[PDB]
């Protein structure tokens, strides 16, 4: 009766299980090894994951995402007040706690962040159970190192709502280190840097590990820098391209923009493996198809400042930890955006040619470690 490890991500979640002496990252029903942290409400259905993200352009007011930004926070939290301004869904105040408010089956309903995240966790649980062939009841769930007691509590509550006994809540960078077996070291402090550039957030963590004991020495980053911002640079580029070619501005058609955004994310992923990608959108605007392409070099240029901006938080973290570059024993890549070759070059160059740990898909490393830790806690 295996326990599972779940990365409850800002933009994508991932689930793994340790059995038969190895971790298996589990693909969902569509074959995807990570699942959007999306929940949608319609006149007839509640959709979660791929199904929810796949109709986000159609249903912006009732498709919820970014619940991780709300979870465990008070309504009057400056972070909440700030983030609310840029979401298409309504956030309301219930006793100084935020709720997301939507239309569902024709009625106005509101949900706590931990309710939305419970739905994502249920999906991840079900993905695992489909693979294992039996019900899962124990899990380790991960959170950012900077999460406070309230954020951790709300995340655990999300797990319990999903029918999971939460064995432990552990930090995302700790989980990534565990994935690479860095917890197995003996007596003697090792310094580990986790470079996590995900879908919506950028987190640099410096850990010391000593005889299997973890300590957080420094954290740095940007909570609004991630893969979606690279998607956005491509969107703006292609909006201009469409304008020049067709003399039409699509920028205020929310559907067109959202659909373009989706196609840009796809092309971006392809550019991590190939030096060019083709974008082909049928009926992008007024029935006009948009078939074009983008090179890796052009993509890099469009994002050059954003990519470069990831290094100063590394510098800052090193300063705070009172360590020189040469004193870092291991460099660990986390988050889907670290699969971008230019990002890898920047970090490697900054560390004067050091190896990067990147053999585990970086968007799966957190779940991988959580799965290992879950197995350890089960015995």
Ligand X SMILES: Nc1ncnc2c1ncn2[C@@H]1O[C@H](COP(=O)(O)OP(=O)(O)O)[C@@H](O)[C@H]1O
Residue 12 interacting with ligand X (CB under 6 A): yes
7 has catalytic annotation: yes
C-alpha torsion sign, points 24, 277, 342, 241: negative
How far, in Å, CA of 132 to CA of 284, rounded?
A: 41
In the complex with Cl ion, the residue whose CB is nearer, 168 or 248, is 168
How many DSSP H helices and E strands does the chain contain? 13, 18
Among 363, 369, 370, 375, binds ligand X (CB under 6 A): 363
Q: Considering CB distances under 5 to 8 angstroms, the limit depending on partner class, which of Cl ion, ligand X, none binds residue 363?
A: ligand X
Contact partners, residue 67, CB within 8 Å, separation at least 6: 37, 39, 100, 113, 116, 117, 120
- Taking residues 17 to 46 in sequence order and writing x for each that binds ligand X by CB under 6 A, - otherwise, the string is -----------------x------------
109 has catalytic annotation: no
Among 98, 144, 173, 199, binds ligand X (CB under 6 A): 199
Question: 228-247: which residues touch ligand X (CB under 6 A)?
Answer: 228
Choose one: 109-117, 149-157, 220-228, 311-319; the region binding ligand X (CB under 6 A). 220-228
Buried b or exposed e, range 198-216, using 16+ CB within 10 angstroms: bbbbbbbbbbbbeeeebee
Question: 264-293: which residues touch ligand X (CB under 6 A)?
Answer: 265, 268-269, 272
In the complex with ligand X, the residue whose CB is nearer, 120 or 256, is 120
Answer whether 13's CB lies under 8 Å from 118's CB: no
How far, in Å, CA of 28 to CA of 124, rounded?
A: 8
> Which phi-psi region, left, alpha or beta, contains residue 283 (left: φ > 0; alpha: ψ -120 to 50)?
left
Q: Which of 78, 347, 40, 297 is nearest to 193 (CA)?
A: 347
Among 142, 171, 337, 357, binds ligand X (CB under 6 A): 337
Query: Binding residues for ligand X, per CB under 6 A?
Result: 9-12, 34, 198-199, 226-228, 265, 268-269, 272, 335-337, 339-340, 363
Could you list the active site residues? 7, 68, 172, 196
């Amino acid at each position: 009766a295996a326990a599972i490890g779940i990365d409850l991500g800002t933009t994508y979640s991932c689930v793994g299980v340790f059995q038969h002496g190895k971790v298996e990252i589990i693909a969902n029903d569509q074959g995807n090894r990570t699942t959007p942290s999306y929940v949608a409400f319609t006149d007839t259905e509640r959709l979660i994951g791929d199904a929810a993200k796949n109709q986000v352009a159609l249903n912006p007011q009732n498709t919820v995402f970014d619940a991780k930004r709300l979870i465990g926070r008070k309504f009057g939290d400056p972070v909440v007040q700030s983030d609310m301004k840029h979401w298409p869904f309504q956030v309301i105040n219930d006793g100084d706690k935020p709720k997301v408010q939507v239309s569902y089956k024709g009625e106005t309903k509101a949900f706590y962040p931990e309710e939305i995240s419970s739905m994502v966790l249920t999906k991840m649980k079900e993905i695992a159970e489909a693979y294992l062939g039996y019900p899962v009841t124990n899990a380790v769930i991960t959170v950012p190192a900077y999460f406070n007691d309230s954020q951790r509590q709300a995340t655990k509550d999300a797990g319990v709502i999903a029918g999971l006994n939460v064995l432990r809540i552990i930090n995302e960078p700790t989980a990534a280190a565990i994935a690479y077996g860095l917890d197995r070291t003996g007596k003697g402090e090792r310094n580990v840097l986790i470079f996590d550039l995900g879908g919506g957030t950028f987190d640099v963590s410096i850990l010391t590990i000593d005889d299997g004991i973890f300590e957080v020495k420094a954290t740095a980053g940007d909570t609004h820098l991630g893969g979606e911002d690279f998607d956005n640079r491509l969107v703006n580029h292609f909006v201009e391209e469409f304008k020049r070619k067709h003399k039409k501005d699509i920028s205020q058609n929310k559907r067109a923009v959202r659909r373009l955004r989706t196609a840009c994310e796809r092309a971006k992923k392809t550019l991590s493996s190939s030096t060019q990608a083709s974008l082909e959108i049928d009926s992008l605007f007024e029935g006009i198809d948009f078939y074009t392409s983008i090179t890796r070099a052009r993509f890099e240029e469009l994002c050059s400042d954003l990519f470069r901006s990831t290094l100063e938080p590394v510098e800052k973290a090193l300063r705070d930890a009172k360590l020189d570059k040469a004193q870092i024993h291991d460099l660990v890549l986390v988050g889907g955006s670290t699969r971008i070759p230019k990002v890898q070059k920047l970090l490697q160059d900054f560390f004067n040619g050091r190896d990067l740990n990147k053999s585990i898909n970086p968007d799966e490393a957190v779940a991988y470690g959580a799965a290992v830790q879950a197995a350890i806690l089960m015995g």
